[PDB]
Symmetry: D2
Subunit: 506 residues, 4 copies
């Protein structure tokens, strides 16, 4: 890995890679002109004794007053310290890296007036695997989170290295840096932004994609377990509807299931009964989810590359303009859009689990266990799946419709983006456990169809679980199988089965 | 108006026209081949004594049993009668027409196996302005609504004509029809569909567009009232973010405000203070809303043209396949997506109203009235605006995450689309009243800037309200001005000001 | 009816009577002392040239300035006119009466400083059946609603009489009144209050009680239809839990079902299978609902008698104190508490309906119809019941957790009580339709148990529906039976069956 | 501590003690009769070869079949193992103890048929401070949680001791136990119950009480900081309303503030301006919260002592009856009721924080810092408070209105109680941080009133924070003060100030 960054061109695949593992990045040569021209425009401003809100002024009373250079540098440090008023648990290192890399990418577009050196410090922190402490709560949509992150560049706050908390000065030394002093506009350029919000929603995107991919394999498996039909996936149906999310989704089911399989060939007349909607309506429901997560990816993919601070410096014209790109509204809706998709992927999955337990519909023993008079089988695991799916209805309440006036009514409408994306992580754990249980149930039920095989990709799916979780013979401690199946899903065991070019970042 | 329908090609503008006023439609010649081939494929099935679920069978126990022709026609009538189990208030005629026209358009794509004659009956009901009674509630996403609608073709139920309820037989006679008898597959082809759901969400789309257009004019007016800046609308800002909803939105503000105006020219140094986010962040917030309503339009625009019944007939291959296009999931999410946009358009608008009341920020007398020691001015109208905006937070809870298993667990996952789109109408009345109050306040405040004028399009906006509502001199009954401003907005007084090609159906 | 009001002593039964039908009221003799002493304390204040916020001052700038008497009367009229800035549909006359009677009751406690004459005008409007126009929306918790109501006392606004809108002057003449002029403190005493909020929540209470009573009869009927057990209602179970709502609820089931019935006696060994939770858990679920509606009644019963305006006059000490009894917080929570109860009464009822449709559990034909291969029976009516129950989940989102700062941040936290209670009316229509459908289904299913009878009170329940809705023989238009059953429930057909002293206002 | 338990008599104070710290308990002598009579009734059943669902039968097919004794013991073990299908993070030891003690208390009422020995094993696990591993998720309202807990009695699963995970056999050895074998009915008696649900809601109760008590001190402090009035707390106001929550609340403010203080005495004419509702309406809002948490305590206080398993054994009559006390509905509503109270305590607190930042209302420097042109003071800490308060609106969506049919539709309506109470913990952290920030702000602002003191109890409140957090002189890292104030609140620093007999468990 050696990313050579052309600022404002990060793709969603690049973003998923960054979220997933360490990165080694360097600024492309072409980003230097604009970055340094932005600094020179700020320096010409101060050189000429001109005033510019957000560049060489103070705030509140002194908003149009040209604070002396002598203490315009101490203002930079006061902003960072006073703004780091975040609260709650620390962000994990992967999320701290994604935020750092997004701040670098926005600042490197050269519209923010910050020295190249300061951007290089964030890059060296990234390259050394030195991750500032960022608390989870605080932003209303990302001063607090970005200030905490910036504290390390001043030699304050603290940082994580090889899983341990180092002092900012040792942490900086790990990266081969020494405490920095900030210049005019650099405080606002590091503190104003939508990176924390975007990173949180991007994590939500990534999980929703992982869960989509897993649902198509789990769903394909359950279709087979209960001797369901392939007819509902026919392209002609989906083409007649015209929904693109749905067309692609059915195409995924077809790829994974194939025209037929040993199991399916074994049901002479498959047509005899209609499949219930948890199976038959998979392309329509999972299709709606696909569209939702695609609509959200497009907004989040652009946000990742956005110049989100304020005021902005347009050095080509000499203008410094105060706007509002820090308002993370589109990110908050993108996140509330993903909540719907994660919740519904989970709901459809719980209903497939419930059908598999029902002997009037499954064509399988009650609760998937032989000798059900004395064993309970999957009975309580289904209960667990219902618990998790239900939690997601309340969790899907939108955060994007709430706002409270802050900063004495000057900040009178805010996004609440951060709370929007963070709640997706928990929604994704909820749907992750539902899918885990479905995976186990479909595998158990196919197993009961003694000796028969499903398609080539679904068999790989059965084999990945069977490598860790044995067929359920008689009652035993059930927890540990669920745990093991959840962990497998979280590692991307089923992601690879989905065909290419379907999900935004894959 | 004489729409010559090429089935499956209705544009969103065509849909808005249909929702808005009466229509005169006829099938284009090119739609006859497929429509009649679909019937002939059904007739060949019955001719050859072959069985086909949903064509010549019964249900439940007889699902694979070839019910005798002799009573396969009485099954059509039993479906319609037993399925019309809707409840609540009657749909207004505009919505009944939109549903009728969508059913015609889907059936006319020729994949549903229904006689051309039956489609022509719906067209003659449309052309005569004869609107079946459809109750509001019942569908979980649209058997009930579509059955009630179809009752009139059998000479049952009732219909509205020139605002009066006529019996189905007189109503049919108004259209020059006589009670019809339905053939194999026609019951399911009229009853299975997503038209009620799509029509409800389309009404929601249309209102959200009307409110977007009104917010840009109201917002432009409030910017002027409080001597706000034009700087936040600069294209360079919005281009640096890259959000398309936001770019277009700022472009709309620029078009309406212009480079400057008499009022704005009168504030020598405008820059002195920063504008609060309710004004300055308008492109970012209203931009996020624009994207949301665009994402929703794309799904709803395709749904309008979708073949949504079941089973589907593919006469080119001779196949009749059972799928699930009746599952209105994508429509339910599209509607929950619009709820966010309507709510946030209202929230941003209430905050602009609150700023206008605040003498520390407005640069206008307290509560916009001269001699505020004895008059209360707009003080309680703001209260009313807060009431309405707040109602929208709860109203935006998603319906798309809920489902209940129906029909003995065969219909084990449903959309809840109908409840999703219907709640948007009330959300839109809530935001409509907020905007009305803002419009009044911005006009009142500009009025207090004695003799000065805003831009050419905003002045047209002031003049439309001033044609109905006088400047507020001293306290008087406040209700009636709000009423009059709401009605003006509902008639599209401000829609025309927005530039071309911005909103999906405009 | 001739209520002789002892102010602040209205019982919940008295409140239900007032909501239900016209009233003829008069002030008891004992309420004159305090009412007139309150006026005399205000008059002594003005007599002595003393200042008192809310009595003889102005507002805003003049808050501590003793506005001249000469125009302290014109201030009363300006408050009413400017405060009537309500919006939306008119309240129906029953709700207008409940509000009027609550305003009378609070003012008549003699702490508000308003003339006896003015209170008598509201009483004469009540006695003549002259109901001011009050718009639905506006209050954030009740200036707008109470101002609109008070407009008629000044000879402004409009009023309903014998179902027609009369001008305020004719309306006043119907009551034998002539336009009034208001004195110091009377504007605030009529406009400040929590009556609109309390009346709306009280309507919600009353409906939730009506639905509770109907659910116990419907539930008893469904127990019988599917040959369920009486064992779950045993007192010993409920006593061992200790929940009072649950004890009383089971006691209601026992009263209605009896020890046994002909139907139940016909199942030799009833014990063979366990009853599903929709039946067996009725005392626990309906019990939780009973407690919720009891907790809410206690807060609302006290609110009805509360002195809710501001400032308050304590004539015994000579003090006039500014407080905040107008904040309707407890009413907003009481209403969000009732939402839970109405929603869950509906949910449990939809699940009983779903069991009755399921031939594996009902011990009744599929979808309750004989010859189900060609008839659909209750299949779509269940669908309708699911629609309505689902709408209630979103509807139960609390309004009491939202607030927006109004009146330039002086009114910085409000209740949102009005939106809280109003949404209960729609929730109650939703659960009312669910119960209607259950009632029909239980009756249809018992009917299929040829010749057998249920207990004496449940048979009365079957007979009330059978007086309007015939047994379902073969498919027919289903709508009209639902309509007829809903109307019967709304008229209190089943209320009388419940035993005495169970529900708060009954 | 040596609790001598009289089963079914635990008070809410006793419950708070148990949640807070280790316990040493023993069964009172009087609980032996009923506990052993319950066992003897089960033993007589089996002795006589009689059948009894839930005592000596199997399930599913064998529900009325008298499974042989020889393997009716292996059925006990299969239930525990197969039922422990919980997921997510481990409960902390305090919550594991509260659940264990509630299971002991319900079983010890002697209606569940379980041997005394088995109850004594749970007591010895409690006395040794040996806490079974219980996963957080799984129950829909508490098989999973209670099974995981019971695994340790069989020598399976795992347990925590002195903060370390021990194997069940070592853990049992720590308590002086050896793996147990379960008898007829003991599996259901340990697994069926509402203890997990009740314990989770009780934790929520306890936190809401702690936050109530802290809000009254924080609120009293903020009243003083901004030179607010004591008039709104006058008893006469609250008595005239009649709301008990509100009366008690105002009585708490009076106790803490006193008739006056040095600070308050320093504002000659206090009356000059009205206090905003965040202060003046404290008794009405905090009063509504008090009532809510009292309504919830009463249901939860009874649930703690409830016999919640199934079937129940009534040895006095010889009857074993199947009911539904395991349905945790009342607990789910009690928890959704507490969500409203925690959210609104937070909202009112954020609005007091916002007033303190506003120089037009505070009578304190902008953002509570001297020399605000170059320092930001509390500006971003307020932002953090808004973030947390907003998160609570969505979090307050009710879980009690959701349900999904489990166990093949026999468990067709469930509570969702567990998700209801668990979300309160996070709501409480949100409001805990809001209050922390208010505490800091009120203290900072009082500090700016150079040399002056507030009342005797509020000064203790200032002194507890000042022992850990210094006055804010100039900008510095803000995070750490918030952290330190939150921790102080969580330790009950302010709880002791509230007067006696106000909150249910205090």
């Amino acid at each position: 890995t050696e990313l050579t960054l052309k600022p404002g061109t990060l793709t969603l695949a690049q973003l998923r890679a960054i979220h997933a593992a360490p990165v080694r990045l360097q600024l492309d040569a072409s980003a230097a002109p604009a970055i340094d021209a932005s600094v020179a425009c700020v320096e010409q401003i101060i050189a000429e004794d001109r005033t510019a809100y957000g560049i060489n002024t103070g705030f509140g009373l002194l908003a149009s007053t040209r604070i002396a250079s002598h203490d315009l540098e101490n203002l930079q440090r006061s902003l960072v310290l006073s703004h780091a008023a975040g609260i709650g648990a620390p962000l994990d290192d992967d999320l701290v890296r994604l935020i750092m890399v997004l701040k670098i990418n926005s600042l490197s577009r050269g519209f923010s007036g910050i020295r190249r050196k300061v951007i290089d410090a964030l890059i060296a922190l990234v390259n050394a695997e030195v991750y500032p402490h960022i608390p989870l709560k605080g932003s209303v949509g990302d001063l607090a989170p970005l200030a905490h992150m910036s504290l390390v560049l001043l030699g304050e706050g603290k940082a994580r290295y090889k899983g341990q908390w180092l002092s900012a000065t040792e942490a900086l030394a790990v990266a081969g840096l020494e405490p920095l002093t900030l210049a005019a506009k650099e405080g606002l350029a590091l503190l104003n932004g939508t990176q924390a919000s975007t990173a949180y929603a991007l994590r939500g995107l990534f999980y929703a994609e992982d869960l989509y991919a897993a649902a198509i394999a789990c769903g394909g498996l359950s279709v087979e377990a209960v001797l369901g039909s392939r007819s509902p996936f026919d392209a002609r149906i989906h083409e007649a509807r015209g929904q693109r999310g749905q067309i692609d989704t059915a195409a995924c089911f077809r790829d994974l299931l194939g025209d037929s399989s040993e199991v399916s060939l074994s049901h002479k007349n498959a047509d005899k009964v209609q499949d219930p909607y948890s199976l038959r309506c998979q392309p329509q429901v999972m299709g709606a989810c696909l569209t939702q997560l695609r609509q959200a990816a497009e907004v989040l993919g652009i946000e990742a590359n956005a110049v989100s601070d304020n005021p902005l410096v347009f050095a080509a014209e000499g203008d410094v303009i105060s706007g509002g790109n820090f308002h993370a509204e589109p990110v908050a809706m993108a996140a509330d859009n993903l909540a719907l998709a994660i919740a519904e992927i989970g709901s459809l999955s719980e209903r497939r689990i419930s059908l598999m337990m029902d002997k009037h519909m499954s064509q399988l023993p009650p609760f998937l266990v032989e000798n059900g008079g004395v064993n309970s089988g999957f009975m309580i695991a289904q209960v667990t799946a219902a618990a998790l799916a239900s939690e997601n209805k309340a969790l899907s309440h939108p955060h994007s419709v709430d706002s409270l006036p802050t900063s004495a009514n000057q900040e009178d409408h805010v996004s609440m983006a951060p709370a929007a994306g963070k709640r997706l992580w928990e929604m994704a754990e909820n749907t992750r456990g539902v899918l885990a249980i479905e995976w186990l149930g479909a595998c158990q039920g196919l197993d009961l169809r003694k000796g028969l095989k499903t398609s080539a990709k679904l068999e790989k799916a059965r084999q990945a679980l069977r490598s860790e979780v044995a067929h359920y013979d008689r009652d035993r401690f059930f927890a540990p199988d669920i745990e093991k199946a959840v962990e497998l899903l979280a590692k991307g065991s089923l992601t690879g089965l989905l065909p290419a070019g379907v999900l935004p970042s894959l």
